Every structure is written in C-alpha cells, then in structure tokens.
Amino acid sequence: SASKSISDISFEVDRLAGQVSAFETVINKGGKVEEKSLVNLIEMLMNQLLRLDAIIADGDVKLMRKMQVQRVQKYVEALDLLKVKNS
C-alpha cells in the first residue's frame, strides 16, 4: 500500500535528518568532515524524495518533474533575494 510506503519514507527521512543534524554539530564543534560524506547523504535524501514523488504521481514522470520544479522555487527565490540584498 501507498500509505505504508509513505510511512516508511517518513521514518527513513527522520533518520537521515538525524544524521544531518549530527554532521552540523561536528562542524559547529570545529570538526572536519569529507565532502563525499555530505554528497552521499544528499544522494540518500534525493532517493527518498524520488520514491515519494513516484507514489504521489502514481509513476507519471511528467507530474514528477513538475512537482520537483515547483517545490524548488521557494528556495531559489529566497537565494535570489539574498544575492541582490547583498548583505
């Protein structure tokens, strides 16, 4: 069922978010981490996002691409404002 799949994704993303927080703590304490550990984590999160989208869209790749382009805008817009604000 799509319901249980979404639940599992929720659980897994909670786990990955816990790992992100921990890495943020390492950095805040003065520590050095390898970029590939962070790139790997990004990939793990992206995999969950794609599984979720495939469920939401019932596999329709056009809807999936559309949902992704839509959700990204919020962040791209805030980052654009920051670049122009320029401090």
Side-chain angles (χ1 to χ4, degrees), residues 19-38:
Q19 297 166 28
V20 176
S21 290
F23 277 114
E24 290 176 316
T25 299
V26 172
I27 303 287
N28 293 335
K29 300 294 180 60
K32 291 308 174 178
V33 320
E34 293 299 298
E35 187 171 296
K36 77 170 56 188
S37 300
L38 303 176

Side-chain angles (χ1 to χ4, degrees), residues 51-84:
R51 288 178 35 93
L52 181 57
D53 284 349
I55 288 158
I56 292 166
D58 198 27
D60 182 320
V61 300
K62 286 178 184 176
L63 297 179
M64 300 171 62
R65 177 159 193 170
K66 183 181 183 180
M67 289 157 25
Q68 174 68 357
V69 170
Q70 196 287 318
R71 73 176 55 109
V72 163
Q73 297 312 317
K74 166 196 285 198
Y75 303 85
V76 171
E77 282 169 8
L79 288 168
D80 282 342
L81 187 148
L82 280 172
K83 165 202 171 298
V84 176

